[PDB]
Amino acid sequence: SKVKVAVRVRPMNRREIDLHTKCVVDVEANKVILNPIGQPKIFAYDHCFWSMDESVREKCAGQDDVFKCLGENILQNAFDGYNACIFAYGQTGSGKSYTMMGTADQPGLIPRLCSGLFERTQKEENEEQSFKVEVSYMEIYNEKVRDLLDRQTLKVREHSVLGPYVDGLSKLAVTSYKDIESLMSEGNKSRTSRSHAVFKITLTHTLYDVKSGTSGEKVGKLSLVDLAGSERSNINKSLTTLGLVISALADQGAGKNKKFVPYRDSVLTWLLKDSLGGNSKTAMVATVSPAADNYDETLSTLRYADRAKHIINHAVVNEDPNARIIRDLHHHH
Ligand SMILES: Nc1ncnc2c1ncn2[C@@H]1O[C@H](COP(=O)(O)OP(=O)(O)NP(=O)(O)O)[C@@H](O)[C@H]1O
Ligand SMILES: [Mg+2]
């Protein structure tokens, strides 16, 4: 199916109100309207998120709104055995980290996803099924991969059956929200700006046919990606190549060229090869600032978001034969 695209407009901050910077971003349903400072440009997306102001009430509603629309679906995708990915893209200060991680007072997607994950595994585990949860957390800076849960820099390779992976990146089993919160909290403290963070959850769902004792695995993966600022040769390579990737895959999603998609020209696009054009259910959250002083970066974000929704993915359930048979036998009962 198509890459899902959401656009999130952060509200006017105090500086923009104090200095009379004009608000140029309007939203109506799932349409974004960019006004000039010379015709109104209208973009259409799957979802649009916006807030009336920065009050606690509106911010609480905003984070809940994003999770209700994107968080639940990606959680469900992982429980159905899909690789799923949310990546936030946009100018610095537009809301990428606020959306993906949030703050202590305003938790974002990742805290809610981790809470819902363990809520669900602990609710659903029974004689017919169990769940294993493993997390990795890594950062891409200057085309180098650092392990945030810890071999000073790690190499990307791609296996013909396993896909791209980070050689030597720790993958830690977790059994509760507090385990994973403590890991993400220490990863969060180990950052380095123009870097990309990737939070990866692997959900292994073992199904058991109690009559036979046969068992099988269905593996879901969550990739929660908080990219570097889109406004910005090594240090920009991943960001620049993602633009080309999105453009090339978007052309193919229609009928232009037929089109060098340069996945392996950067660490970021190589590790996201499946997330874009491959075996994944993927959502983009494009974050934009609302006011006149960012009109141009906003337009550029809106445009890449506009192309990204023409990208075609081919997601399959990642399960062994026993898991598929045992699962179907359970859906029949
Ligand atoms: N949707 C939102 N609603 C309310 N406030 C927001 C929202 N998005 C961002 N903010 C505010 O904007 C500030 C900057 O957001 P932030 O998520 O750090 O941007 P960023 O895209 O990650 N910048 P950068 O890491 O430098 O590329 C935060 O302190 C929030 O107060
Ligand atoms: Mg950030």
Q: Where are the domains of the chain?
A: 1-333
CB 225 within 8 A of CB 196: yes
Instruction: Give the span between the Cα atoms of 158 and 166, in whole angstroms.
Output: 9
Measured in angstroms, how far is the CA atom of residue 103 from the centroid of ligand 1? 10
Q: What is the resolution of this structure in A?
A: 2.2
Q: Tell me how long the chain is.
A: 333
Binding residues for ATP: 90-97
Contact present, 282 and 276 (Cβ < 8 Å): yes
**Would you tell me how many other CB atoms lie within 10 Å of the CB of residue 29?**
8
* 285 neighbors 8 (Cβ within 8 angstroms): yes
Which stretch of DSSP H or E encloses residue 26?
A: strand 25-28
| Contact present, 169 and 145 (Cβ < 8 Å) | yes
| For helices 72-79 and 109-124, angle between their N-to-C axes, nearest 10 degrees | 40
Q: Whose CA is nearest to atom 10 of ligand 1?
A: 95
Superfamily of domain 1-333: Kinesin motor domain (3.40.850.10)
Q: Which two tokens stand for residue 148?
A: 């945030």
| Contact (Cβ atoms closer than 8 angstroms) between residue 307 and residue 299 | no
The experimental method behind these coordinates is X-ray
- Buried/exposed 128-151: b ≥16 CB within 10 Å, e otherwise: bbebebbbbbbbbbebebbbbbbe
Q: How many Cβ atoms from other residues are within 10 Å of residue 39's Cβ?
A: 7
Residue whose structure tokens are 């009962």:
333
How far is it, in rounded angstroms, from Cα 61 to Cα 17? Answer: 21
* H-type alpha helices, 206-294: 234-252, 267-271
CB 233 within 8 A of CB 263: no
264 backbone dihedrals φ, ψ, rounded to 5°: -85, 10
Cβ–Cβ under 8 Å, residues 319 and 216:
yes
Q: What is the CB < 6 Å shell around ligand 1?
A: 8, 10-11, 51, 54, 59, 62, 90, 92-98, 229, 287
| Calpha distance 56→118 (Å, rounded) | 27
Residue nearest to atom 16 of ligand 1 (CA): 95
Looking at all shown ligands, the one closest to residue 94's CA atom is: 1
Residues catalogued as catalytic? 93, 95-98, 226, 229
